Design a protein around this ligand. Structure first.
Ligand SMILES: *[C@@H]1O[C@H](CO)[C@@H](O[C@@H]2O[C@H](CO)[C@@H](O[C@@H]3O[C@H](CO[C@@H]4O[C@H](CO[C@H]5O[C@H](CO)[C@@H](O)[C@H](O)[C@@H]5O)[C@@H](O)[C@H](O)[C@@H]4O)[C@@H](O)[C@H](O[C@@H]4O[C@H](CO)[C@@H](O)[C@H](O)[C@@H]4O)[C@@H]3O)[C@H](O)[C@H]2NC(C)=O)[C@H](O)[C@H]1NC(C)=O
Ligand SMILES: *[C@@H]1O[C@H](CO)[C@@H](O[C@@H]2O[C@H](CO)[C@@H](O[C@@H]3O[C@H](CO[C@@H]4O[C@H](CO[C@H]5O[C@H](CO)[C@@H](O)[C@H](O)[C@@H]5O)[C@@H](O)[C@H](O)[C@@H]4O)[C@@H](O)[C@H](O[C@@H]4O[C@H](CO)[C@@H](O)[C@H](O)[C@@H]4O)[C@@H]3O)[C@H](O)[C@H]2NC(C)=O)[C@H](O)[C@H]1NC(C)=O
Lengths: 97, 97, 11
């Protein structure tokens, strides 16, 4: 959830609400093929997922009744009258203790 | 997308635009800080002997944000421009670095 | 296209 892009930064900086930073490439959640994580780059949130909190290791999954169409959305978009969204497999990431 | 009455095929969204929803009468225009570049998108060609169109390839569903270090200021575009000396862009999708 | 997830249209 934290990054440092220049030498000698005093403190880790947190990834901004629209982005995320995983533990590493192997244990990363939805993150495409060529993308690697080395601690210098926060990655946007995939379409269908969203994030609104700072310094997060994973993006959150949009719930039924709402959708996320763009990339790196701080908030999910609410389905409008006349339409709906029903994804029964959508689920947030569960944390190991 | 499709904007005419009584059509046998839809129309492919051009480069610089996207159609995120279903049954749009018009294509949405990419906004500053984003771009769409689908080079295989094409319109159906009418067989003048049988009056049936064949070749349709759909455009883009969502716009691509400019990468880190790049920016875009115009709305309808297909590319990102790296900005010159003295300026930087540390976020994806910046309308001006 | 650095920092862009889900990949995207080539520049
Ligand atoms: C993964 O983890 C995520 C952690 O945050 C989690 O996100 C959270 O999900 C919940 C829903 O599960 C979000 O709840 C919010 O509920 C608001 C209202 O929903 C209903 O509103 C009723 C109020 O009555 C009005 O509407 C009804 C019908 O809808 C109508 O009959 C009335 O006439 C009124 O018009 C209420 O009674 C019901 O009980 C319901 O609560 C929505 O408005 C929220 O929408 C949000 O708006 C926020 C504005 O700042 C903003 O966060 C977003 O724009 C968003 O659209 C929302 O739906 C909860 O907000 C959300 N948390 C955050 C921080 O976003 C995911 O759900 C979870 N994913 C999965 C798959 O589990
Ligand atoms: C399959 O067949 C389709 C048949 O319709 C075809 O759809 C048509 O596609 C064309 C594009 O190829 C649409 O053209 C329209 O052109 C308008 C102007 O284009 C540019 O405008 C610039 C104006 O300058 C301003 O903006 C520039 C930066 O953009 C800035 O530098 C300046 O300072 C100014 O601020 C100009 O410089 C350029 O040279 C171009 O001329 C766009 O504005 C149109 O946007 C539309 O607005 C319409 C308003 O009603 C709306 O109906 C449309 O949905 C859209 O929002 C548009 O780009 C043409 O409109 C379109 N046909 C229709 C009716 O939609 C597909 O292209 C084709 N598909 C493929 C893949 O080939």
């Amino acid at each position: 959830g934290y990054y440092t892009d220049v030498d000698g930064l005093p403190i880790q900086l947190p990834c901004k609400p629209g982005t995320f930073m995983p533990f590493d490439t192997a244990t990363a959640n939805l993150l495409d093929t060529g993308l690697t994580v080395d601690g210098t780059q926060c990655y946007t949130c995939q379409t269908g997922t969203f994030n609104d909190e700072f310094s997060q290791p994973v993006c959150k999954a949009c719930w039924s009744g709402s959708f996320a169409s763009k990339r790196g959305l701080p908030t999910c978009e609410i389905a409008q009258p006349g339409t709906f969204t029903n994804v029964a497999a959508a689920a947030n990431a569960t944390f190991n203790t | 997308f499709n904007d005419e009455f009584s059509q046998p095929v839809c129309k492919a969204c051009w480069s610089g635009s996207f159609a995120s929803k279903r049954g749009l009468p018009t294509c949405e225009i990419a906004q500053p800080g984003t771009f769409t570049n689908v080079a295989a998108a094409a319109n159906a060609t009418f067989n003048t002997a049988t009056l049936i169109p064949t070749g349709l390839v759909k455009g883009a569903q969502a716009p691509t944000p400019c990468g880190m270090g790049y920016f875009q200021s115009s709305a309808e575009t297909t590319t990102c421009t790296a900005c010159a000396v003295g300026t930087y862009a540390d976020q994806a999708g910046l309308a001006a670095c | 296209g650095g920092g862009v997830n889900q990949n995207g249209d080539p520049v």
